[PDB]
Amino acid sequence: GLMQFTLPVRLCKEIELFHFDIGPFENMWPGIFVYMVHRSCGTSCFELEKLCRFIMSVKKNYRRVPYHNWKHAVTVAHCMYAILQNNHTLFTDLERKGLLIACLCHDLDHRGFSNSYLQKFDHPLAALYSTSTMEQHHFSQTVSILQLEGHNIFSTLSSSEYEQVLEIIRKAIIATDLALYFGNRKQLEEMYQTGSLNLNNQSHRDRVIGLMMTACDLCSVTKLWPVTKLTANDIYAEFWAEGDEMKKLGIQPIPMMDRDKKDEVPQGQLGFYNAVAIPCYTTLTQILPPTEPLLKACRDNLSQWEKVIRGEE
Numbered sequence: 001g002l003m004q005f006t007l008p009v010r011l012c013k014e015i016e017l018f019h020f021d022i023g024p025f026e027n028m029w030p031g032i033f034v035y036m037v038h039r040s041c042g043t044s045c046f047e048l049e050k051l052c053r054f055i056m057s058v059k060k061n062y063r064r065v066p067y068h069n070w071k072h073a074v075t076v077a078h079c080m081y082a083i084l085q086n087n088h089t090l091f092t093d094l095e096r097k098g099l100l101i102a103c104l105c106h107d108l109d110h111r112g113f114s115n116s117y118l119q120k121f122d123h124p125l126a127a128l129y130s131t132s133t134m135e136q137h138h139f140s141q142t143v144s145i146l147q148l149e150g151h152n153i154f155s156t157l158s159s160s161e162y163e164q165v166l167e168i169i170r171k172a173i174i175a176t177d178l179a180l181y182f183g184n185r186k187q188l189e190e191m192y193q194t195g196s197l198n199l200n201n202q203s204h205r206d207r208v209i210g211l212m213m214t215a216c217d218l219c220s221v222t223k224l225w226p227v228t229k230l231t232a233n234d235i236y237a238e239f240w241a242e243g244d245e246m247k248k249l250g251i252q253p254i255p256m257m258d259r260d261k262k263d264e265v266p267q268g269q270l271g272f273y274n275a276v277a278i279p280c281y282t283t284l285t286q287i288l289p290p291t292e293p294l295l296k297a298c299r300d301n302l303s304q305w306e307k308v309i310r311g312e313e
Ligand SMILES: CN(C)C(=O)c1ccncc1NC(=O)c1nc(C2CC2)ccc1Nc1cncnc1
Pocket: 178, 217, 218, 219, 220, 221, 228, 229, 231, 232, 235, 256, 268, 269, 271, 272, 275, 276
């Protein structure tokens, strides 16, 4: 009950910032996440004995892949924690509890392959779920872990607060299907420029929470350049692996994934930053002004990639 988590000074300070890196020590990530829940939500809203057991069962079910791993989960959780603590009044007791859990579980059991590769390989999960394949798998794995004995961190919610919270987590996890992000932002832009955006419209929150999730999931691009550049390797190791696996099915992969077309990365980083990231954080700032630091940092990194092209690094 009275068992606060504290962090080393530098961590206690830097964690509150959007561009925080959770560091190379696996064994502190669970404390960091508990710390975030206790500050973001209250010291009460999860039984520690149950949270810690959930966290470790969650960690246990992330695989040792270069990018879509346990560190990515906690990175994305952290970025969501930065948004919640800078938009304190806007979000319900439950929205805070479910979103942080949503972020931690958003990529459960990821194998390091796109929805595309599941379809062209004809993986069972592509048969069981026609769209948002991995994302429906991830939400599925979340419910499995919640139904293990001694793992129901939501135990004390009512029947209806429970279905309210499992439904926040489900749409939140689905929204990390970047194929849905594009429509979701277009509609949110159209509703902010026309002035129809209304955070009391449930279907409107849904979309906003949807985009926060895109923003949190993409937040490796909102870090300091040395973090961003070193993450870019990890995401490209999965990309080139999947390219290798496309070639094995006798399909030439998009160039993003062809490890012969390594020369073309910086241009593809530009393309990504212009098509996805700058828009996401632009629209997210419009809707949630205090999240501007994410846009600012995103822009800085786009600039850093323009210098790579221009042979200045
Ligand atoms: C949709 N579209 C155009 C592209 O997907 C894209 C295209 C050309 N090149 C790269 C692309 N995507 C990425 O680079 C990227 N993608 C994801 C999510 C799986 C989609 C997350 C992060 C990314 N970058 C990054 C860099 N550094 C740190 N973290 C992440």
